[PDB]
Amino acid sequence: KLLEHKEIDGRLKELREQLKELTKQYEKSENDLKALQSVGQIVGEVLKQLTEEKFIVKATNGPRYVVGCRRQLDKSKLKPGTRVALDMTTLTIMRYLPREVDPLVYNMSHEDPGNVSYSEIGGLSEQIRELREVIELPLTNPELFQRVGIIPPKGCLLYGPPGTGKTLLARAVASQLDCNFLKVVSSSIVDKYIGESARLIREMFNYARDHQPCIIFMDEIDAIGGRRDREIQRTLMELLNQMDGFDTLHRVKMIMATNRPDTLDPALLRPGRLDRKIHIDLPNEQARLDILKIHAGPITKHGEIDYEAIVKLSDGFNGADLRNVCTEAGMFAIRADHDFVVQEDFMKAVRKVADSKKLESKLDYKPV
Amino acid sequence: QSEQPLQVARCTKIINADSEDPKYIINVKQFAKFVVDLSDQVAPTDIEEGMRVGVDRNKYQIHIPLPPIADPTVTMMQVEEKPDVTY
Amino acid sequence: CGKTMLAKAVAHHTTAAFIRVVGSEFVQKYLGEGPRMVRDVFRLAKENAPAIIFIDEIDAIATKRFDAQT
Amino acid sequence: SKMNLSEEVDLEDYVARPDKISGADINSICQESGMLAVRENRYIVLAKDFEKAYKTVIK
Amino acid sequence: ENSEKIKVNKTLPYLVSNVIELLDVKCAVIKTSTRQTYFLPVIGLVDAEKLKPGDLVGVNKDSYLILETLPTEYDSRVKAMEVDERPTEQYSDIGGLDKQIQELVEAIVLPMNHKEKFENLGIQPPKGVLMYGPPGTGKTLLARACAAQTKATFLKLAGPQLVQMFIGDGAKLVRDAFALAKEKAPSIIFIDELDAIGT
Amino acid sequence: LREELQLLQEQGSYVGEVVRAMDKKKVLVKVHPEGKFVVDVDKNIDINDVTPNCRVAL
Amino acid sequence: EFLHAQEEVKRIQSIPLVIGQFLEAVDQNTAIVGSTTGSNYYVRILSTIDRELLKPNASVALHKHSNALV
Numbered sequence: 046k047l048l049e050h051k052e053i054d055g056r057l058k059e060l061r062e063q064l065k066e067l068t069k070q071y072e073k074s075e076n077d078l079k080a081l082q083s084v085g086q087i088v089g090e091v092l093k094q095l096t097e098e099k100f101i102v103k104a105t106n107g108p109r110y111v112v113g114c115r116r117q118l119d120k121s122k123l124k125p126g127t128r129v130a131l132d133m134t135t136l137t138i139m140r141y142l143p144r145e146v147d148p149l150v151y152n153m154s155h156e157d158p159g160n161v162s163y164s165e166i167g168g169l170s171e172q173i174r175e176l177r178e179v180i181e182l183p184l185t186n187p188e189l190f191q192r193v194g195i196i197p198p199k200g201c202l203l204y205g206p207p208g209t210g211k212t213l214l215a216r217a218v219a220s221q222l223d224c225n226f227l228k229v230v231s232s233s234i235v236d237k238y239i240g241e242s243a244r245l246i247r248e249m250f251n252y253a254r255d256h257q258p259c260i261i262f263m264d265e266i267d268a269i270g271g272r273r274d275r276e277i278q279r280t281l282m283e284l285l286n287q288m289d290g291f292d293t294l295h296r297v298k299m300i301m302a303t304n305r306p307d308t309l310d311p312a313l314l315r316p317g318r319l320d321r322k323i324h325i326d327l328p329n330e331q332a333r334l335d336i337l338k339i340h341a342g343p344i345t346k347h348g349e350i351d352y353e354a355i356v357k358l359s360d361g362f363n364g365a366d367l368r369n370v371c372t373e374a375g376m377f378a379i380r381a382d383h384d385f386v387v388q389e390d391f392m393k394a395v396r397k398v399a400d401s402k403k404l405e406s407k408l409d410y411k412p413v
Numbered sequence: 414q415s416e417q418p419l420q421v422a423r424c425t426k427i428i429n430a431d432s433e434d435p436k437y438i439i440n441v442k443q444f445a446k447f448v449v450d451l452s453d454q455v456a457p458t459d460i461e462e463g464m465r466v467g468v469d470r471n472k473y474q475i476h477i478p479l480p481p482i483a484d485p486t487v488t489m490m491q492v493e494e495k496p497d498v499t500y
Numbered sequence: 501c502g503k504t505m506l507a508k509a510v511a512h513h514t515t516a517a518f519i520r521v522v523g524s525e526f527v528q529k530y531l532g533e534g535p536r537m538v539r540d541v542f543r544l545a546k547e548n549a550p551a552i553i554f555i556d557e558i559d560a561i562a563t564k565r566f567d568a569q570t
Numbered sequence: 571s572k573m574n575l576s577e578e579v580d581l582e583d584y585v586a587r588p589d590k591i592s593g594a595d596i597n598s599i600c601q602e603s604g605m606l607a608v609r610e611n612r613y614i615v616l617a618k619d620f621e622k623a624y625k626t627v628i629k
Numbered sequence: 630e631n632s633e634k635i636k637v638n639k640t641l642p643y644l645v646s647n648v649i650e651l652l653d654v655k656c657a658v659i660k661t662s663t664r665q666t667y668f669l670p671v672i673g674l675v676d677a678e679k680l681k682p683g684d685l686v687g688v689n690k691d692s693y694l695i696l697e698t699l700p701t702e703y704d705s706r707v708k709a710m711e712v713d714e715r716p717t718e719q720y721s722d723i724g725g726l727d728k729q730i731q732e733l734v735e736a737i738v739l740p741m742n743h744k745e746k747f748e749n750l751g752i753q754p755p756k757g758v759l760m761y762g763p764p765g766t767g768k769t770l771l772a773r774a775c776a777a778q779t780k781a782t783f784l785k786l787a788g789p790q791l792v793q794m795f796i797g798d799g800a801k802l803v804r805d806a807f808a809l810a811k812e813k814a815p816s817i818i819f820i821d822e823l824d825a826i827g828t
Numbered sequence: 829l830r831e832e833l834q835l836l837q838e839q840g841s842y843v844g845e846v847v848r849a850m851d852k853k854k855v856l857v858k859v860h861p862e863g864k865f866v867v868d869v870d871k872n873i874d875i876n877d878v879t880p881n882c883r884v885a886l
Numbered sequence: 887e888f889l890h891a892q893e894e895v896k897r898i899q900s901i902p903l904v905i906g907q908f909l910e911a912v913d914q915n916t917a918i919v920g921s922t923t924g925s926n927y928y929v930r931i932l933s934t935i936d937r938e939l940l941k942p943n944a945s946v947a948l949h950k951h952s953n954a955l956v
């Protein structure tokens with residue numbers, strides 16, 4: 046006799062779920078419709094005040110006007126140059142805005158490094174720790190700098206041989222700090238129209254200034270950082286004087302990477318900026334073992350694998366190479382249909398990485 | 414007093430959600446770019462990428478695909494007919 | 501070598517008006533405004549009463565003139 | 571004059587040292603000696619920290 | 630009636646514009662193709678997650694409200710490198726380089742068609758493969774055959790095509806090409822004559 | 829003051845320059861931002877007084 | 887009536903005004919001005935605008951529609 050107890054009960058449950066989805070339809074079709082009765086406010090930038098109710102605004106590439114406060118805008122929160130939005134009809138300032146713009150700087154601030162940790166670094170110890178001395182302590186604990194009586198350092202340069210986790214240490218630092226981050230490709234900085242490189246760096250550094258605490262990181266700074274076509278040099282100047290000269294208060298630190306520290310313009314290498322230079326050497330045999338074990342856990346490694354043979358065969362390998370080894374080992378595994386990897390697969394991978402290394406032979410690299 | 418003059422813009426990117434309400438992109442040089450559609454007197458059978466299109470003054474709906482241009486310098490490489498040369 | 505240090509020192513300590521625009525900042529896509537913005541900075545300096553214009557890294561935009569082939 | 575420092579330190583030793591180093595180098599070396607003291611978790615800075623920073627700076 | 634008002638007030642022709650970031654005091658910034666700039670307190674007929682601050686969007690000509698998000702296009706060259714021309718070269722038709730073909734296939738094809746063996750082993754499959762050897766051996770043919778048999782998206786380009794004159798245009802081209810490859814997801818980029826730019 | 833208000837109701841009519849009096853009541857002029865046009869003159873219509881490049885108010 | 891008229895003239899120079907550049911004085915009551923919109927206009931001078939402040943470099947404010955100098 047459950048038919049009458051359950052049929053209309055399920056009917057009401059289903060109809061209430063349908064009502065809940067149709068309420069979402071109603072709220073969306075009403076909310077966007079009452080959003081339809083709106084007009085885009087003009088975007089522009091203010092100049093000197095004249096009175097408490099008279100302000101000059103440049104309306105972007107259009108003309109410039111004088112206008113007044115709507116009712117609810119703090120006059121003191123307006124400064125010459127602050128970004129504002131105005132009524133289309135009367136041009137009176139509808140709202141102030143967070144200063145400055147640019148999708149490119151967003152793209153420089155919204156790329157994720159992935160999940161990394163300092164333990165997931167190949168035992169660069171000192172190096173890593175030094176980079177924490179120059180960044181972690183200044184941001185989290187400036188009180189110790191104040192008590193000692195020293196100014197926190199601004200920046201560090203990663204250098205040394207390639208493939209030594211050049212980006213990896215920065216990825217770790219970014220993933221282990223809750224602060225605004227700006228990765229930029231140095232070559233991606235420069236653009237043709239003359240002065241867009243300088244203005245783009247300007248906007249980037251204003252972004253960092255207005256989003257403290259921030260970490261700006263340039264990879265491959267030698268793209269434009271070399272000693273002094275000439276537009277590259279002027280871009281270097283823009284960096285070179287933005288990087289100190291107007292003030293120093295910043296809760297903002299710059300990390301730089303280079304595959305050629307020697308060619309870097311001496312002006313950059315100046316101790317006041319570039320506060321430290323961290324050499325990330327070719328990984329040692331013990332360091333190579335450390336890296337191996339760091340890239341070993343997640344593998345479906347099987348039986349027992351004697352890493353020291355890999356180490357003493359992988360002498361002179363860049364840390365990165367080690368990753369290859371592991372991947373190639375799985376290749377042998379997929380060529381053996383194993384759900385596992387054995388010691389001799391690692392031996393084969395090491396010997397093939399050695400085979401590749403001769404083509405990959407080391408550059409004509411000169412460190413400082 | 415009857416016929417509307419047509420402004421000239423370049424075409425792009427038939428939006429083509431399902432090929433019966435296609436819509437298009439147009440570029441009025443130095444002025445703007447718009448999403449537009451066709452006036453039903455013309456059909457997508459005559460519209461492609463670029464295609465040199467012409468629209469009206471206010472609603473900018475596609476009224477005509479305009480003929481090709483002699484700019485691409487192909488004209489100065491042309492002989493265009495049987496040369497005055499024999500074997 | 502410790503000169504922009506002195507630049508910021510005089511900028512802060514001065515009683516007269518002071519403007520700080522680096523030389524490299526003087527650039528543009530849109531051709532021609534370079535000279536005008538330079539002249540705008542200088543005229544603004546004049547109207548601002550006795551003032552000191554500071555320009556850093558002028559070497560970027562003050563290299564010895566040469567055949568401007570581009 | 572800004573830092574805590576110790577009586578033992580011979581600044582004149584680093585003064586007479588022939589190396590040509592900018593005032594930038596000097597601010598950096600004071601900063602690095604302070605950071606060495608912080609690593610030891612002390613606010614006083616010792617001459618050994620100055621030595622370590624001095625070889626840290628220059629090259 | 631809400632839907633039919635909204636439909637009859639799409640107005641059909643509308644401007645295009647470039648997206649600029651959002652704010653909470655939800656409300657976004659826009660730059661027109663007329664190089665005018667506007668702020669929308671309400672974005673409009675697209676939800677927040679359709680947006681990327683840098684996207685190309687169709688906006689109301691009069692009220693400037695966002696009403697559509699659009700495919701971007703990428704320069705024109707990069708918009709020319711996508712190979713939907715679909716090569717048809719077959720591995721059986723390769724002249725005896727089978728010992729190499731497998732080395733490429735397990736490095737490329739199965740990273741698409743399985744992706745599960747490598748993560749079953751818990752490792753990332755190979756990401757970069759360099760064909761190398763003197764000319765006239767089959768590198769381009771092998772790349773085109775792999776483009777053929779996979780049914781994936783093929784992005785062929787030559788290194789010399791990126792020796793472009795303008796100061797930064799090559800970097801922009803490379804970035805846009807990789808962005809297009811990401812947008813096309815199971816896609817294979819081919820860099821013929823990397824030496825021309827890998828100097 | 830009344831006529832002041834009333835004269836504050838028309839518009840600037842921009843600026844142009846005469847180049848040829850191709851015909852009476854039909855002057856060729858060149859405007860500041862835009863190009864060239866055929867333009868007539870007010871009831872004073874002293875066209876022959878107008879030398880080219882004189883710069884005029886429309 | 888005079889007070890009504892003068893409150894009207896003051897209402898003219900209220901707030902929603904464009905910016906331009908004073909170019910030259912056509913007559914004692916009218917002048918050529920250069921708007922930041924790009925176009926230049928033959929524009930009435932507002933009588934209260936007291937003349938010695940004017941020079942060809944004097945930035946000025948115009949009524950939005952009549953473009954009158956205010």
Ligand SMILES: Nc1ncnc2c1ncn2[C@@H]1O[C@H](COP(=O)(O)OP(=O)(O)OP(=O)(O)O)[C@@H](O)[C@H]1O
Pocket residue numbers: 285286289290312315317501502503504505506556557592593594595597
């Ligand atoms: N005599 C000094 N006393 C104190 N600090 C000094 C001295 N000389 C240099 N410094 C420190 O080193 C820095 C030297 O840099 P400087 O003032 O020349 O500016 P800069 O921006 O590095 O120069 P440039 O424009 O040449 O690149 C100072 O900012 C200061 O912190």
Ligand SMILES: Nc1ncnc2c1ncn2[C@@H]1O[C@H](COP(=O)(O)OP(=O)(O)O)[C@@H](O)[C@H]1O
Pocket residue numbers: 165166167168169207208209210211212213214328336339363364365366368
């Ligand atoms: N010391 C290390 N510890 C762990 N991984 C490393 C180390 N050195 C290199 N790698 C590997 O190298 C890769 C990145 O190398 P990296 O030098 O950052 O590239 P780039 O030279 O482009 O910055 C990572 O996948 C990482 O696994």
Ligand SMILES: Nc1ncnc2c1ncn2[C@@H]1O[C@H](COP(=O)(O)OP(=O)(O)O)[C@@H](O)[C@H]1O
Pocket residue numbers: 722723724725726763764765766767768769770
């Ligand atoms: N074994 C082969 N079987 C069939 N065709 C081949 C073979 N080897 C080479 N070819 C042809 O010759 C070309 C090899 O040169 P390619 O790989 O294009 O490099 P490059 O452009 O430097 O010569 C291929 O495009 C292919 O068409």
Ligand SMILES: [Mg+2]
Pocket residue numbers: 501502503504505
């Ligand atoms: Mg200096």
